[PDB]
Amino acid sequence: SEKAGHQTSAESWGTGRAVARIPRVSGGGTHRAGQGAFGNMCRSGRMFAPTKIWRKWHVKINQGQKRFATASALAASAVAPLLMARGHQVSTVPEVPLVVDSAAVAGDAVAKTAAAYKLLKAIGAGPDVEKVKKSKKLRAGKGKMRGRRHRQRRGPLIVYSPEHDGKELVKGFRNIPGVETCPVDALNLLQLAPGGHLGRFIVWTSAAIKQLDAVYESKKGFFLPANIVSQADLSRLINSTEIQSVLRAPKGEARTKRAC
Amino acid sequence: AIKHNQQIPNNHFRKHWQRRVRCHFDQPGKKVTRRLARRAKAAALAPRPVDKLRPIVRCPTVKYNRRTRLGRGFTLEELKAAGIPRLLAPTIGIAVDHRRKNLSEESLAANVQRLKDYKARLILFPRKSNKPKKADTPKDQQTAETTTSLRTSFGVEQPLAPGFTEISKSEIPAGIEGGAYRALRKARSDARLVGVREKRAKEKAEAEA
Amino acid sequence: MKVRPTVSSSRRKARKAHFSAPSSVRRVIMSAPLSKELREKYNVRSIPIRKGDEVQIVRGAHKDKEGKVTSVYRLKYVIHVERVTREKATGQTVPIGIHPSNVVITKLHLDKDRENILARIKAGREQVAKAKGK
RNA sequence: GUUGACCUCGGAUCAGGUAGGAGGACCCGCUGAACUUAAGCAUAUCAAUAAGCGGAGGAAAAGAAACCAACAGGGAUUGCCCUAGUAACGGCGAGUGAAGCGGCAACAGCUCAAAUUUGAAAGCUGGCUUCGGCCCGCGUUGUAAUUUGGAGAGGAUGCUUUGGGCGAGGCUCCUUCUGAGUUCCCUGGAACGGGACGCCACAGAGGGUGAGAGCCCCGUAUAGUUGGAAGCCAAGCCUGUGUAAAGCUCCUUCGACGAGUCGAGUAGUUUGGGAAUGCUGCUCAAAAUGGGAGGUAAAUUUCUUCUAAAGCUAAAUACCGGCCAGAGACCGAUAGCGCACAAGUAGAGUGAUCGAAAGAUGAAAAGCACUUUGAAAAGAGGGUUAAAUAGCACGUGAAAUUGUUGAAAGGGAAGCGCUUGUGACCAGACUUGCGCCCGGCGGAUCAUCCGGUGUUCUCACCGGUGCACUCCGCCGGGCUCAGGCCA
RNA sequence: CCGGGACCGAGGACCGCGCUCUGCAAGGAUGCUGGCGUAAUGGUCACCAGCGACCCGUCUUGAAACACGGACCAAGGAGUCAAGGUUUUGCGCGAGUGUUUGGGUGUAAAACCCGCACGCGUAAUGAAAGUGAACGUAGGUGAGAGCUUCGGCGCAUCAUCGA
RNA sequence: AGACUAAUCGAACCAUCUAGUAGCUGGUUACCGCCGAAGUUUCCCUCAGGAUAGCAGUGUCGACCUUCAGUUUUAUGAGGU
RNA sequence: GCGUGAGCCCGGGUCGAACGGCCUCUAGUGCAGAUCUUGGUGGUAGUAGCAAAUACUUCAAUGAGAACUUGAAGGACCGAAGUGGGGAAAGGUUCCAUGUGAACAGCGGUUGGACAUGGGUUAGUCGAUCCUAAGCCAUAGGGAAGUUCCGUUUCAAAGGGGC
RNA sequence: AAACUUUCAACAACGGAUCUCUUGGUUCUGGCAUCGAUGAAGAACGCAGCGAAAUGCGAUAAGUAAUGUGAAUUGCAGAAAAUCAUCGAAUCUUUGAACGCACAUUGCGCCCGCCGGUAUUCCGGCGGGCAUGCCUGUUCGAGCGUCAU
Ligand SMILES: [Mg+2]
Ligand SMILES: [Mg+2]
Ligand SMILES: [Mg+2]
Ligand SMILES: [Mg+2]
Ligand SMILES: [Mg+2]
Ligand SMILES: [Mg+2]
Ligand SMILES: [Mg+2]
Ligand SMILES: [Mg+2]
Ligand SMILES: [Mg+2]
Ligand SMILES: [Mg+2]
Ligand SMILES: [Mg+2]
Ligand SMILES: [Mg+2]
Ligand SMILES: [Mg+2]
Ligand SMILES: [Mg+2]
Ligand SMILES: [Mg+2]
Ligand SMILES: [Mg+2]
Ligand SMILES: [Mg+2]
Ligand SMILES: [Mg+2]
Ligand SMILES: [Mg+2]
Ligand SMILES: [Mg+2]
Ligand SMILES: [Mg+2]
Ligand SMILES: [Mg+2]
Ligand SMILES: [Mg+2]
Ligand SMILES: [Mg+2]
Ligand SMILES: [Mg+2]
Ligand SMILES: [Mg+2]
Ligand SMILES: [Mg+2]
Ligand SMILES: [Mg+2]
Ligand SMILES: [Mg+2]
Ligand SMILES: [Mg+2]
Ligand SMILES: [Mg+2]
Ligand SMILES: [Mg+2]
Ligand SMILES: [Mg+2]
Ligand SMILES: [Mg+2]
Ligand SMILES: [Mg+2]
Ligand SMILES: [Mg+2]
Ligand SMILES: [Mg+2]
Ligand SMILES: [Mg+2]
Ligand SMILES: [Mg+2]
Ligand SMILES: [Mg+2]
Ligand SMILES: [Mg+2]
Ligand SMILES: [Mg+2]
Ligand SMILES: [Mg+2]
Ligand SMILES: [Mg+2]
Ligand SMILES: [Mg+2]
Ligand SMILES: [Mg+2]
Ligand SMILES: [Mg+2]
Ligand SMILES: [Mg+2]
Ligand SMILES: [Mg+2]
Ligand SMILES: [Mg+2]
Ligand SMILES: [Mg+2]
Ligand SMILES: [Mg+2]
Ligand SMILES: [Mg+2]
Ligand SMILES: [Mg+2]
Ligand SMILES: [Mg+2]
Ligand SMILES: [Mg+2]
Ligand SMILES: [Mg+2]
Ligand SMILES: [Mg+2]
Ligand SMILES: [Mg+2]
Ligand SMILES: [Mg+2]
Ligand SMILES: [Mg+2]
Ligand SMILES: [Mg+2]
Ligand SMILES: [Mg+2]
Ligand SMILES: [Mg+2]
Ligand SMILES: [Mg+2]
Ligand SMILES: [Mg+2]
Ligand SMILES: [Mg+2]
Ligand SMILES: [Mg+2]
Ligand SMILES: [Mg+2]
Ligand SMILES: [Mg+2]
Ligand SMILES: [Mg+2]
Ligand SMILES: [Mg+2]
Ligand SMILES: [Mg+2]
Ligand SMILES: [Mg+2]
Ligand SMILES: [Mg+2]
Ligand SMILES: [Mg+2]
Ligand SMILES: [Mg+2]
Ligand SMILES: [Mg+2]
Ligand SMILES: [Mg+2]
Ligand SMILES: [Mg+2]
Ligand SMILES: [Mg+2]
Ligand SMILES: [Mg+2]
Ligand SMILES: [Mg+2]
Ligand SMILES: [Mg+2]
Ligand SMILES: [Mg+2]
Ligand SMILES: [Mg+2]
Ligand SMILES: [Mg+2]
Ligand SMILES: [Mg+2]
Ligand SMILES: [Mg+2]
Ligand SMILES: [Mg+2]
Ligand SMILES: [Mg+2]
Ligand SMILES: [Mg+2]
Ligand SMILES: [Mg+2]
Ligand SMILES: [Mg+2]
Ligand SMILES: [Mg+2]
Ligand SMILES: [Mg+2]
Ligand SMILES: [Mg+2]
Ligand SMILES: [Mg+2]
Ligand SMILES: [Mg+2]
Ligand SMILES: [Mg+2]
Ligand SMILES: [Mg+2]
Ligand SMILES: [Mg+2]
Ligand SMILES: [Mg+2]
Ligand SMILES: [Mg+2]
Ligand SMILES: [Mg+2]
Ligand SMILES: [Mg+2]
Ligand SMILES: [Mg+2]
Ligand SMILES: [Mg+2]
Ligand SMILES: [Mg+2]
Ligand SMILES: [Mg+2]
Ligand SMILES: [Mg+2]
Ligand SMILES: [Mg+2]
Ligand SMILES: [Mg+2]
Ligand SMILES: [Mg+2]
Ligand SMILES: [Mg+2]
Ligand SMILES: [Mg+2]
């Protein structure tokens, strides 16, 4: 509150009364009289530098950088080691860029949670869904008083084409814990890299996979970035003939014997 | 107290600025409210477009002289030339501006053609369905794909003139005789010296008597 | 997950409403399930408990005890069951407060009002089932 | 001559009405500081702010140009972005500081004075009235119709225009109704915990229930539905009718347009407004293509742009003051509002005013019957509870400080560092593990071969074979190797 | 050249210098033996003993000060936030760059998408009217990393003479 | 008598402006590692304070160029203690 | 037990419902001081002290308990400008009866202006009420932006008697 | 050697820190526009079977009517719903802008009507009225201000 700690008429007593020069509540007949009133070190006083609403709560991010981050997260989602390192259960997933026929989700095919659950189990997201189900815990903080009562892991993210698949699949997948859906044309970085960690497990539909290229071609002012390296296999580069044939002979070994 | 090589500070915070800080945490909520109001007014104007027809207008100053935009309303002369009565124009979605004038045939003709296209595309339902008049759409061409946004369907087609154009050689115009730079210098000098030359000429003319 | 703007998921508000609800709202709050036989008979799952109902306790230290509801202390959100009692130091017998959600109704006190209730619930449930089965 | 008019001015507890106060977060005005900054201080700044006064609403205010401009011209008001920390102001110091254009949100236009209805005050308040009208009064010192500069008035001219009633159907509103375990086992006082087996999910938001409950209960999702009131919109229908009124196309002519007002001087204040931006006081005091403005004072000559001195008007904008509602990377009883509680309370002051402290037994009072000692408070037994060292001085229960018990030291402080000693009390390490021979027991693969799969394509696995001078394991004996502490 | 004593044993296959060369005292300790295998070693605490040891914080040239504050304990308690500026990090795009005033859209304060204008930059200079940037392969000289066909080509940058 | 004006008088009390300003006093909260000062110059109504240069840290970059030096030697000037 | 250290981990006891590690994000994030704030608690310390107003004593009753309860007796003081009997202001139930654990009566307490439960204030003649005083507030008017100021009979058409 | 002081430990005190909790704050966002002479806000005094306060209410007083729900309230007692929700009908003490004049007084008046005491006049009981500024209208008036007979 703007007026917290200031709703008093306290004045300092000055020196010469053997008390500190802090402002003191005037009057009598109550415990409050004669007590320090205004400083940050005083009980019932004003906090130091009271928090203001005009703090910079939001962060402006370049749209180009947002689109790079989204593209990088999408690329990381296609790497199986990254999914496991992010904690997804993908040992039974048939293929890392997991694509399910849009005929299995289109219209009212998975409009019911039972049907959606059966489809996820069939395609191999069942272990991840069960991991989310079993991970539910009570929060350790004071967020229990503030509405964040339970914590749980993230599950598969279902990406679909709303133009071709409809939106009944959203209702079908809504109630399964840890499973969230996103239209292919509105991909969210907060979901593609939860907590800033890359490798979200994604279940695509065939229509969404078909539409992804057009989605990225329709972005005005953005082109997919060119990497600063061409070959990421450092072992291949270093142990290729082109490099190894011009090196000088090694001047030592991994271990050096002690001479003196 | 400056201490190094600093730009001289001039932050106007010597009043009690905190008393008048305007944050904007209500930006998304206000956008939602605006969208709701737009939807409600569009529903109220059920078959009509949500806006009025506006004329093409040239921005005033020597800056922005090159660009056109939408104006407030059509002039009385433009309405008369298009054949739309003054009292009938605002009741069929046409904005009327009584204080704008048509100083140029180009603007007059452009706005008249705009009004004529709008009138050609207008579908006028009868006041009473059971007795349509001769000025209303006769119930057969009353079904068509309509537009609800005149600002988009009747926008400024090209605010600026085309910046690129190709002409064949030997059609290249001959330059100003003394050159463009000299011509500008001469025009400037004449504008500067118009008054002095005038007074000198009249003085020399009257010197005889 | 809640969607409707009129619904609030505030723990503080929910607790305040529950613990300051008026008597008529506390009546609905203190509902109890019907037995399997009554549920099959009436096509009704739960009903607000009433004095004179016959219940069986299915939770707590007094499980399997049956008896008639002798009082519905809304102010304390409890019911009193016949012969489900305790002894003070003086040996005087006092009833033990049982939450209605910890009991099942084995026999209902039925009068037209208590029944218009059951008919409304049955008709609503049957209609909802039919509409979902369309 | 008196009465009778009308002109002013009065009476009445005459008939009917209206205003005050509250609220004042936001809004419209008036009035109006100083602290402060200038490293002093007076102009300046704080600030056209605080305090004081008057007046409204859900918004207020502003508002349809006596505008901006100088362009190829824009076109009521308001607000956001930008213009722009710019033009400018300023002991030209400190510091201050707009506007036009441009993009957007929202868009809405209008009515009076100034004219003769003059072939008919055609207008209005009040009372009575069957509803047709009547009467009084207001009003000609002007109430209606027409007209508002975008014009209009007057004429031509031929076209064109209009009033009422339903109304399916839809959107609202109130109301009835909503899926699934309390199945088995263990812990527990109590499962809402763990394990097993199931179910619902457009509902796995939230809360309660004796501990972390989608399926025990309230609720939660979804469009539906039961009954009802009738609030809105509305496709389309039904039906009057041109005396009257209304628009357009042309036109000689006419074409009313706001005065102690504009403007000027001076004074004060204010502004970025600078030979004077607005406002106000005083003095002077207009005109009719006149007048204002065109950011340098003046005369002269042009040009541009509007048309003051009368008035109304949604929206986009401010505001959490009031009434509701939803939320949070907020605080968590010295925090968060002064107030989580009979808090603006108790209490203080003559008064204006000042103004606290203070949440938690337990799932359930089951809040300790009874015996005994005591004058009593209480104690000791006993009882309740999962628990009483949870007993209304009640969850947990720190430190300061204190009592008892045990150990120790102490010839005018104590504490502390390095280093032994004594006494007390302790953590580790070890109590084996590797191999190799000689016996016993058990088993079936141990090599090889055949077939089938996999895979890193030559390396394995699985079956069939093997079948005891193999292989594996467990005991018993001997030997080897290493392995603790101090020397 | 012979003795007597003390402290220490870092490293962990070979590799090397070498010598008195079947080996060695030569690029860092091994061999043999004994007692015990537990409070024995060792740690902790209390006390005695030898030596040492002024009360902290602060201002100050100088504090143990006869300088000030501090009886004790628990909890609270002091470089924050916003705007503007600057330099240096890390990013994206790059002669451009900046979506989020606004609009569209949404699983609804999120995320996603859109563009006109505008800001900054792309040109300076003068008070202003105004004018406004190639003689050269965008110059010559000396350096200059790196390349080089080994003759010079010469980045950044510095000094210098010019346009 | 600068006396008295509610224990308050060389200008009462209450609330607010107000968290008034202070070149002045006091305080300013975990650890380790590396580097490491100044009380001097010029200007200031400057003398208990600032700016300015110096001393210090950090971050770099350049070919870290074959140069640099609180030093000696040699050769050659100046000085008035 | 680990770490140079801030600290981290474990054993035992108490206790009763939530909590932690890792990588990022975030801040109202680390106390011995500020004559710091609030609260609590010490030594001093069973210490200073409880000494103005002449003063108490005997027997009995009551009671667990009697110097400060009561009865009787004695001895004393106030000595009619009283320590007497009634009032004004002010207080508000302190008045009366009954009962009484704790707290208060700076010792005690059976007693009390304390605590608890019940009662108690009767007016034509006593006061208020009526009158006017100093004075205050209206009105008519006049000022003031206004809250309001003056005005009290003043530049006012301001009433009461009968048939 | 005790006592005393100090140190260390266990238990017991004192005190209320720590942990956990939260029908409370704080901040943001969304919807809405509704006080009063038809007497508001605020104040006082009263009202329950057993209440001091808080909450609610006004002599119809912990509330009445009406509608909805459908069996309680609860500390005890009592009885045949409810300390329920909703809320369109009422009641609404003394006050307060506060209005007969006053008020530091439960003070002092006047008018109309009714009912009693022999009563138009006095007394008593009851009910309804009596403020100011201003507007419109009504009626009664004033003025050689003025017009005709
Ligand atoms: Mg506080
Ligand atoms: Mg200030
Ligand atoms: Mg009247
Ligand atoms: Mg009146
Ligand atoms: Mg008012
Ligand atoms: Mg100053
Ligand atoms: Mg100063
Ligand atoms: Mg001064
Ligand atoms: Mg000012
Ligand atoms: Mg004010
Ligand atoms: Mg509005
Ligand atoms: Mg208005
Ligand atoms: Mg006009
Ligand atoms: Mg114009
Ligand atoms: Mg405009
Ligand atoms: Mg000026
Ligand atoms: Mg200013
Ligand atoms: Mg614009
Ligand atoms: Mg009438
Ligand atoms: Mg349900
Ligand atoms: Mg059990
Ligand atoms: Mg629970
Ligand atoms: Mg279980
Ligand atoms: Mg639950
Ligand atoms: Mg005019
Ligand atoms: Mg004037
Ligand atoms: Mg002027
Ligand atoms: Mg003037
Ligand atoms: Mg002046
Ligand atoms: Mg002024
Ligand atoms: Mg002026
Ligand atoms: Mg000019
Ligand atoms: Mg006007
Ligand atoms: Mg006007
Ligand atoms: Mg207006
Ligand atoms: Mg508090
Ligand atoms: Mg406390
Ligand atoms: Mg407080
Ligand atoms: Mg008081
Ligand atoms: Mg407690
Ligand atoms: Mg026990
Ligand atoms: Mg305990
Ligand atoms: Mg306990
Ligand atoms: Mg406790
Ligand atoms: Mg202690
Ligand atoms: Mg010593
Ligand atoms: Mg030792
Ligand atoms: Mg085999
Ligand atoms: Mg030892
Ligand atoms: Mg020692
Ligand atoms: Mg010494
Ligand atoms: Mg000194
Ligand atoms: Mg010192
Ligand atoms: Mg000394
Ligand atoms: Mg000193
Ligand atoms: Mg000092
Ligand atoms: Mg001291
Ligand atoms: Mg705390
Ligand atoms: Mg602390
Ligand atoms: Mg910054
Ligand atoms: Mg640009
Ligand atoms: Mg220029
Ligand atoms: Mg080179
Ligand atoms: Mg004197
Ligand atoms: Mg006083
Ligand atoms: Mg005095
Ligand atoms: Mg004074
Ligand atoms: Mg004061
Ligand atoms: Mg050093
Ligand atoms: Mg000077
Ligand atoms: Mg000093
Ligand atoms: Mg000499
Ligand atoms: Mg000399
Ligand atoms: Mg518990
Ligand atoms: Mg802090
Ligand atoms: Mg402390
Ligand atoms: Mg310190
Ligand atoms: Mg203290
Ligand atoms: Mg003390
Ligand atoms: Mg003594
Ligand atoms: Mg004494
Ligand atoms: Mg004595
Ligand atoms: Mg005495
Ligand atoms: Mg006795
Ligand atoms: Mg005595
Ligand atoms: Mg005497
Ligand atoms: Mg005597
Ligand atoms: Mg006398
Ligand atoms: Mg007496
Ligand atoms: Mg007396
Ligand atoms: Mg008196
Ligand atoms: Mg008495
Ligand atoms: Mg007694
Ligand atoms: Mg005593
Ligand atoms: Mg006593
Ligand atoms: Mg007593
Ligand atoms: Mg007694
Ligand atoms: Mg008493
Ligand atoms: Mg008398
Ligand atoms: Mg009287
Ligand atoms: Mg009188
Ligand atoms: Mg007066
Ligand atoms: Mg007056
Ligand atoms: Mg020690
Ligand atoms: Mg305690
Ligand atoms: Mg806590
Ligand atoms: Mg009333
Ligand atoms: Mg009255
Ligand atoms: Mg009245
Ligand atoms: Mg009196
Ligand atoms: Mg009388
Ligand atoms: Mg009579
Ligand atoms: Mg009478
Ligand atoms: Mg009366
Ligand atoms: Mg009358
Ligand atoms: Mg007369």
Author numbering:
A (entry chain LC): 54 to 313
B (entry chain LL): 2 to 210
C (entry chain LY): 1 to 134
Copy text verbatim from the article accompanying this structure deposition:
During the biogenesis of most eukaryotic integral membrane proteins (IMPs), transmembrane domains are inserted into the endoplasmic reticulum membrane by a dedicated insertase or the SEC61 translocon. The SRP-independent (SND) pathway is the least understood route into the membrane, despite catering for a broad range of IMP types. In this work, we describe a cryo-electron microscopy (cryo-EM) structure of a ribosome-associated SND3 translocon from the thermophilic fungus Chaetomium thermophilum. SND3 forms a complex with the biogenesis factors CCDC47, the SEC61 translocon and TRAPɑ beneath the ribosome tunnel exit.
We next analysed the structure of ribosome-bound ctSND3/CCDC47 by single-particle cryo-EM, resulting in a final reconstruction at an overall resolution of 2.2 Å. The map has density for a tRNA bound in the pe/E hybrid conformation as in the structure of the (TI)-POST-translational state20, however there is no clear density for a nascent chain in the ribosome exit tunnel. Notably, ctSEC61ɑ is present in a closed conformation. In addition, our structure reveals a further tight interaction interface mediated by two salt bridges between the second ctCCDC47 latch helix and the C-terminal half of ctSEC61ɑ within its cytosolic ribosome-binding domain. ctCCDC47, therefore, effectively braces both halves of ctSEC61ɑ, which would actively prevent the opening of the channel through rotation of the N-terminal half away from the ribosome-bound C-terminal half. Surprisingly, we further discovered that residues 64–91 of ctSEC61β (hereafter called the vestibule binding domain) are sandwiched between the ctCCDC47 latch helices and the entrance of the ctSEC61ɑ channel. Therefore, ctSEC61β and ctCCDC47 appear to act synergistically to keep the SEC61 translocon out of action, with the ctSEC61β vestibule binding domain similarly blocking nascent chain access to the ctSEC61ɑ channel and potentially providing a second brace to impede its opening. Like CCDC47 and the SEC61 translocon, ctSND3 interacts with the 60S ribosomal subunit, forming salt bridges with uL24. Namely, ctTRAPɑ has an N-terminal domain positioned beneath the SEC61 channel and interacts with the ctSEC61ɑ luminal hinge domain via its TMD. Interestingly, hydrophobicity analysis of ctSND3 further revealed a membrane-embedded hydrophilic groove within the cytosolic leaflet of the membrane formed by TMD2, TMD3 and TMD4. Strikingly, such a hydrophilic groove formed by three TMDs is a hallmark feature of the Oxa1 superfamily of membrane insertases, where it provides the route for IMP substrate insertion.
